[PDB]
């Protein structure tokens, strides 16, 4: 009903942000994949 307007900002300031270090752990995980094209030789042509 009412018009959509951007409004004001909301993000507060942050100072002295520390970097993130990956934690060591013996537990299992899942490696997040990327699905895309794949490169391969033409082994049939190599035989020729």
């Amino acid at each position: 009903e009412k018009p959509y307007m951007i409004g004001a900002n909301s993000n507060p300031n942050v100072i002295n942000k520390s970097t993130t270090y990956t934690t060591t752990t013996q537990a299992d995980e899942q490696d997040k994949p990327k699905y895309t094209t794949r490169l391969e030789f033409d082994t049939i042509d190599m035989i020729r």
Binding site: T22, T23, T25, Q26, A27, D28, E29, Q30
Partner: protein, 148 residues
């Protein structure tokens, strides 16, 4: 003139209940410290196995969640805090959740420490906090969280 209290997502601490939900087929949601936040499900039908997905949203008619087999580990469940999908959501990402201990400024210009026991938000989205030893509710800007 405010919205009713909003509940925090309870991490499931005991393995037995988690497996019990999993056997029933209720979806779990696991956060991995290193890689990502994932859902876990035991396969429907008689062909039983564990499945994992990264389609982190409610199953909308236009958002079909996709599953792939994965050999989930027991230790992964134990070490990583896990949630039930029906609770963990964007509906509440409160800065200080329930049971959090905070330092709050009192009327006598003394900073006392208290725990958050109830949470509700006004229509404008500001979170009202109930604190132990105090009657009224407190605002986020007034509070301070002491870490360690």
């Amino acid at each position: 003139i405010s919205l009713n209290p909003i509940q925090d997502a309870k991490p499931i601490d005991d393995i037995v209940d988690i497996m019990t939900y999993l056997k029933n087929g209720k979806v779990l949601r696991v956060k991995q410290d290193n890689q990502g936040d994932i859902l876990v499900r035991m396969s429907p039908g008689k062909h039983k196995f564990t499945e994992v997905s990264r389609d982190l949203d409610k199953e909308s008619f236009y958002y079909k969640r996709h599953w792939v087999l994965y050999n989930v580990s027991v230790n992964s469940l134990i070490t990583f805090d896990v949630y039930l999908d029906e609770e963990y959501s964007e509906t509440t990402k409160v800065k200080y959740p329930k049971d959090t201990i905070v330092e709050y400024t009192r009327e006598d210009q003394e900073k006392d420490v208290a725990m958050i026991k109830e949470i509700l938000t006004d229509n404008n989205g500001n979170y009202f906090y109930a604190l132990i030893g105090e009657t009224m509710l407190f605002d986020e800007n007034k509070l301070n969280k002491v870490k360690d």
